[model samples]
Target: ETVPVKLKPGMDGPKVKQWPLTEEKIKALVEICTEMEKEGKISKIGPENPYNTPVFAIKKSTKWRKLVDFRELNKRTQDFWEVQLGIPHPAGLKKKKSVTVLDVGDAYFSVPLDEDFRKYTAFTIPSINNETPGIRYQYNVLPQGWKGSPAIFQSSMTKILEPFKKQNPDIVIYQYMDDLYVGSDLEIGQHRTKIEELRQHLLRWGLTELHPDKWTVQPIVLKDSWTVNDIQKLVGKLNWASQIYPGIKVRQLCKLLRGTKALTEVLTEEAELELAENREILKEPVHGVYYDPSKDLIAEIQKQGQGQWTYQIYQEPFKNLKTGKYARTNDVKQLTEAVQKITTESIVIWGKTPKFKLPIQKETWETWWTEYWQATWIPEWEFVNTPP
Candidate 1:
């Protein structure tokens, strides 16, 4: 077995790795890599390290997922693509007035890729070793979507939120694909333990969760950035909660999900849906479609550990005449644009673990939106709705 070498202060010379770039550039890369790790900034999954590689469960390794060098783009494009559109935003939605929660739980996972648990990959209960019917087992496998990841994730959350629900059964808890909402119970003080418990439980499962700051506690009125848009305005009493993939967030989530097929499926569908919806909303007037924030699915799931429902909203178009040509625009006059803002409660959840919210290992909001418009958004519009 070969042991990697380490340098000592008195060593004659350090072993050097060769690269095509100039020594200065090479030095800079090394420095950046070191700084990034110390600051917890690396998250792209790749083949080099199975334990800590960045994986994209959703993308097919050929499209939308490009490993690009930031040095290559101009400021305009860089701002638009790398920073503006690349960041994740809150679902910016309110909970439904009455939500049907689809609370899912009960998933036994054997997460093989988790660096912390690799040693236990095929562990056996000492007393049951060898003679046990199914003594050795591994975690959830990759590249195949698990029908249960969402349920288990949701279930785990719903259970954690059970006690809180007793206080305010009116406040629903919905869990789907790790996304959850507990906006019903308005007792703000009760949320601390509930959110913390949920966060800790998820961490144990090798699944991360947004901190307290990520959630909007019981509200006088649910606050969502997407609701104000005319295109987004849906009638009837409403409350809201949402999960944002934005172009960049989805891409990053998918990257980390690459090999785990089950996880990949969940993330891919989510990413594609957001990507498509965003494009539809952006053409002519906007960059995304707004959905009525409904945690009813979560609420129902929580009631009995599973829930389901379906409903539809209408999409109306505006007709605009320009010059001799007549153009129809999706942009309406009295709608609100979703803006990215963070609340005090959100930071609490992220900071639960001393250093949980590391420099997010994802693209900037600007980068994501810019690219979405050019590659996914614009192309999609021109192909589907734009005149030839």
Candidate 2:
């Protein structure tokens, strides 16, 4: 069933339309694109071709969706920003301290509607045409998107799973709205039982399990099981895994922090300048010998300092390490090299920015590591060392 929408013929080319970019807009876009290009993020393809596809404008200031104020909804949903923060340590980080990976399989769907939401009821189902934009599929005469979609779905799923949890306490059922993850021990019997229970429970709730093989139990490792990507994901958090073996994942982690070094400088310097700048009398004329000499330098210092601080404080100290307690027996080579790595990274950061230092912990490595883990995840960058 092909929808014959007219399109431009090219290799991976985006369909084009009339561009309303005025001279001012073009200039602003040029500056923005120039900076982004300098940062090696994006590049332009040159002049437009006339034979390009003529497309309709889907303006943001105009309507993007049917009957919904997406902008308002977005603003309200913005409060839930906390949900996206913090790299959730994969579940059961490491199993039996071996190379246990999540077994991923292809996803499948069971057709016949599941029990809970599908009830045989005598109700008139509406046949909506494109003219009636708001009218949609009916669930026993109930309207879809009537402000109760979230609540109804939540209650229904919760009700369906109540008995399953009571029967099996050890079987973990973690969910993010529609997506479900069920995990138990690696043992075949436990795995089978967990999947069956989840399947039946989900089917009863009119939801699909996304296939047993498709969904996986998230991994968690307290030891040096964290990867380069894992460290990158925890960009702003306290990575206990890194502290488990300082600088264990440093090199890989440094790649991510390198781009933000200039921004890091700005933040670090601003922290020191806060008290100093407060003393500057804004209204008073500095035309005489009272002008601050370090004003320009201070701005430059802060700009260059943020990236260095973050890279040094986090990435440098924890590169390629599995510094957990298991480090003593599990990875001695990593442990030994990590000690030097931690200092090296710290020195790198310290050399770039003035705030950080390279500390050598010999006897108290374990204590230091444990204490670091115990501390709360710092809210670094953006707003730091500001109003309590």
Candidate 3:
């Protein structure tokens, strides 16, 4: 939990506007914090000029999920990874007789933070009792939304799995931060043995609680719609589905989900068509060949998300290229090369459309090309076909 910080010259720490809580919420928060302190997970701090973050509690199904607002801190703090999340497509995964998934309990909290950096994790809340005005406590373990927490936890977990990963190459393991997926083509006996070995490894690594509900068997069915916010979810669901149904037409529509940043912008016509095409493809179990090179085409790169420059290809290529498949190397260089090689001269007319050419000259083409793709522009060649 060595949470790093980068403050500008002469700049003071960020002061977040704390959310007011009800009496019930306050009591709940106090009880939790008291229990954490008892377990040596946190301690009250009294510093002259402490960097105090704000705290908020959200009601979950049966408990309160305490959260600290660390956005300002996260913005200045730098930590990242280029590796993507989620399991590789089922087609890509080796056929496993059984699959086991595990959810790490209190994932972020499980990682111990260094003593020196604990002060930065401090957050203040209203005192449960009137005797004290404000109570400030800092985490002894990593807390969520602290920019570097996920990467730190992932790195630690990766090291723990290093030996098991080497020994059981057949037991394919996919770790998306805290959640882990273990699968194997090996027989049940071997698969169970590897599971036991993994459990032992996790326990040995100080992850004591290994409960039954924390595990699951897969194939995993792992969001949608038309508005900007809706479109974002649509693309996310599209990405997950594209991975599941690899080579499907939905892959072409995946970029639509990532490029749009404005939540207010009503989805474009191309997105609507993309949505319809996705629906149509899902109805049929299987259709034509994965890709028809002579007929297939690709489009511009659609970049979105943070840190890693994840760019999506919007059209089919020589073979079936899934949507949400990011250009996986150096950012601009990799993206530029991918867009160059896969750039297409023809527009994919999935549904009814006027004759057109992509507006490569548009100033914002590099950032987002949804407008150009769905623009009402006919090429010079179309003039010849126009009725005199």
Candidate 3 residues lying further than 4 Å off, grouped into runs, are 1-12, 58-65, 79-101, 105-116, 127-132, 153-155, 171-177, 181-197, 208-388
Q: Over the stretch 222-249, how does candidate 3's per-residue lDDT look in tens digits? A: 2233456765565667665665465445
For candidate 2, write residues 220-284 as lDDT tens digits.
Answer: 32113324344345443324443432322333344444553332121122232322232232222
Note the Cα lDDT for every prediction shown.
Answer: 0.26, 0.29, 0.50
Pick by TM-score: which candidate is best? 3
Q: After superposition, how far is residue 117 of candidate 3 from its true place, in Å?
A: 3.5
TM-score of each: 0.25, 0.25, 0.42
Give Cα distance to truth, residue 109, candidate 2, Å. Answer: 15
**lDDT score for residue 51 of model 2:** 20
**Once all C-alphas are superposed, what RMSD does model 2 give against the true structure?**
24.6
lDDT of 1 at 27: 39
Q: How accurate is candidate 3 locally (lDDT)?
A: 0.50
Candidate 1 on 26-114: residue-level lDDT in tens?
Answer: 33444444453454433233233221111111121333221111111111132233233232222321322222212222232232133
Model 1 bad stretches (over 4 Å):
1-148, 152-170, 185-190, 197-314, 318-388
Clash count for each candidate, listed in order shown: 86, 34, 2
Instruction: Name every residue pair that clashes in candidate 3.
Output: 1-113, 251-323
> How displaced is residue 249 in candidate 3, in Å?
20
